């Protein structure tokens, strides 16, 4: 009858806190987790939780996200439990996931409240963006340890850019993040370049720093010449949606129009 839930991602953990739910394990993260989970044990990093540690807690439900569904299949196999891959790649997707979590875990009122808040902020920002005369063309880079990718409309940051009134210069939509070389970056004309870090932020920012100094293509971008290359904080600007999308939407709108 009772649920023993283990969220494997920081976004899921913060979502279950907004839903007023207890959990039995939590991800290993450098990020701030809700205070109420201070004492629950860590189960390893989101992308590779410890199979042995998760089993130990006798969970009823182990939760993951759409963004890494394929890379998580072996984990769930070894766990020998049902895969849960909540869509956290857009506001609409996360809204659906929140409703689903509310239904699964008897938190329908709490889910509706959070969804209503996020919907209200989204609508308000989209309303403001509609009234803007100009809309920046935007290139979004997602830096990970060793390399950087380009974010599409299918990624959370892509959705945020769209909501805030930006036009993503990357038009391909079949995956969330694409290689630095999938679309050619000489064929785009962005007003704004956004750089988001992941996994190892310190290493990523010095990597972006060195890339922009050493790869000749960047000096020629007008966003670079006009000082509109922005390094975004991984919190609220992460690799998936999170319940602090209200802050992310508001902050991005304010960066675009100031």
Annotated binding site for heme: 10-11, 29-30, 47, 198
Cβ burial of 245 (10 Å; 0-12, 13-18, 19+) is buried
- Shortest Å, Cβ 101 to ligand HEM: 14
User: Is position 145 an interface residue for ligand HEM (rule: CB under 6 A)?
Assistant: yes
Cα(46)–Cα(107) distance, integer angstroms: 24
Q: Looking at beta carbons only, is 69 or 128 nearer to ligand HEM?
A: 69
Q: Please, what sign has the CA dihedral across residues 164, 166, 171, 177?
A: negative
- Shortest Å, Cβ 133 to ligand HEM: 34
Within 10 angstroms of residue 211's Cβ, the number of other Cβ atoms is 17
Structural tokens at position 42: 């860590």
- Shortest Å, Cβ 219 to ligand HEM: 26
Q: Looking at beta carbons only, is 86 or 253 nearer to ligand HEM?
A: 86
Q: Looking at beta carbons only, is 29 or 123 nearer to ligand HEM?
A: 29
User: Is position 68 an interface residue for ligand HEM (rule: CB under 6 A)?
Assistant: yes
* Cβ atoms of 126 and 252 closer than 8 Å: no
Cβ burial of 61 (10 Å; 0-12, 13-18, 19+) is middle
User: Is position 179 an interface residue for ligand HEM (rule: CB under 6 A)?
Assistant: no
SS3 sequence of 17-29? HHCCCCCCCECCC
Single residue of 239, 243, 249, 252 touching ligand HEM by CB under 6 A: 239
Single residue of 21, 23, 67, 91 touching ligand HEM by CB under 6 A: 67
Single residue of 37, 122, 176, 191 touching ligand HEM by CB under 6 A: 176
CA atoms within 13 Å, Cβ hemisphere of 119: 12
- Shortest Å, Cβ 221 to ligand HEM: 24
Among 229, 181, 234, residue whose Cα is nearest residue 203: 234
- Shortest Å, Cβ 147 to ligand HEM: 6
Structural tokens at position 145: 């340890």
User: Is position 29 an interface residue for ligand HEM (rule: CB under 6 A)?
Assistant: yes
Q: Looking at beta carbons only, is 49 or 136 nearer to ligand HEM?
A: 49
Which residues of the chain form contacts with ligand HEM (CB under 6 A)? 9-11, 27, 29-31, 45-47, 65, 67-68, 144-146, 176-177, 198-199, 239-240
């Amino acid at each position: 009858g009772e649920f023993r839930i283990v969220p494997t991602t920081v976004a899921l953990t913060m979502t279950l806190d907004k839903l007023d739910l207890p959990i039995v394990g939590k991800p290993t993260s450098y990020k701030t987790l809700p205070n109420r989970y201070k004492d629950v044990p860590e189960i390893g990093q989101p992308m590779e939780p410890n199979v042995e540690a998760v089993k130990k807690l006798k969970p009823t439900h182990v939760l993951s996200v759409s963004t890494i569904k394929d890379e998580m299949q072996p984990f769930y196999k070894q766990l020998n439990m049902k895969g849960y891959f909540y869509d956290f790649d857009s506001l609409k997707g996360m809204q659906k996931s929140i409703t689903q979590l509310g239904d699964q875990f008897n938190r329908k009122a709490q889910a509706k409240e959070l969804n209503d808040h996020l919907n209200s902020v989204k609508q308000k920002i989209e309303n403001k963006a509609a009234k803007q005369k100009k809309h920046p063309k935007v290139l979004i880079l997602m830096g990970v340890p060793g390399s950087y990718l380009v974010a599409t409309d299918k990624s959370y940051i892509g959705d945020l850019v769209k909501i805030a009134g930006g036009e993503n210069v990357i038009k391909v939509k079949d995956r969330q993040y694409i290689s630095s070389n999938t679309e050619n970056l000489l064929n785009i004309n962005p007003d704004i370049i956004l750089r988001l870090p992941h996994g190892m932020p310190e290493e990523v920012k010095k990597m972006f720093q060195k890339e922009f100094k050493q790869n000749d293509i960047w000096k020629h971008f007008k966003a670079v010449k006009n000082n509109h290359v922005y390094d975004l904080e991984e919190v609220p600007f992460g690799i998936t949606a999170n319940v602090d999308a209200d802050k992310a939407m508001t902050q991005l709108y304010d960066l675009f129009y100031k």
